[PDB]
């Protein structure tokens, strides 16, 4: 459908529960069950547009990953139906 | 690395064990453990170039999927390191 806003909140020693891949756009390859990501509504196929309010279209994979690793246990994302 | 050729062989009522996504290229979003795909050497991040000898760059997702569903229990693929 249209856009999609969501907030993930995790445990202090656990993961958000999703994998991403980048081609050239960045999208969700996998979402673990019962993870903050699934419970939040993340779905394989979604594409990452913003992270904590920042757009990522111009950033490289390792960077995006770095931002997410440094976001503490809360995470605000914005995705768009990919495929 | 360079190319990568592989052959998957499955059970008669089981799956090959992998998911694919297409953007616009088609690549492996997930590979289940102990599946013909993993044991064959398929890796998340790989991109599908050919299926049973046919190139897919010009084919749509549902088609690619259809070809694989009709390939019986054996499957010959060719992938290239994606990301």
């Amino acid at each position: 459908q249209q856009r999609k806003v969501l907030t993930l909140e995790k445990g202090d020693n656990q993961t958000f529960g999703f994998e991403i891949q980048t081609y050239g756009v960045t999208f969700v390859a996998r979402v673990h069950e019962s993870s903050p990501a699934q419970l939040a509504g993340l779905t394989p196929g979604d594409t990452i547009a913003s992270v904590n309010g920042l757009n990522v279209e111009g950033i490289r994979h390792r960077e995006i990953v770095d931002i997410i690793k440094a976001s503490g246990n809360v995470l605000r994302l914005e995705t768009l139906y990919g495929t | 690395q360079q190319r990568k050729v592989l052959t998957l062989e499955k059970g008669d009522n089981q799956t090959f064990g992998f998911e694919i996504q297409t953007y616009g290229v088609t690549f492996v979003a997930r590979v289940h453990e102990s599946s013909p795909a993993q044991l064959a050497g398929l890796t998340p991040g790989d991109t599908i170039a050919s299926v049973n000898g046919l190139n897919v760059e010009g084919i749509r997702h549902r088609e690619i999927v259809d070809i694989i569903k009709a390939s019986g229990n054996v499957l010959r693929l060719e992938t290239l390191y994606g990301t």
């Binding site: 993961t15 958000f16 529960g17 999703f18 994998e19 991403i20 891949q21 390859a29 996998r30 994979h61 990953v65 997410i68 690793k69 | 998340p44 991040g45 990301t83």
Partner: peptide, 5 residues
Amino acid sequence: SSSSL
């Protein structure tokens, strides 16, 4: 490459 998060 796929990254876990």
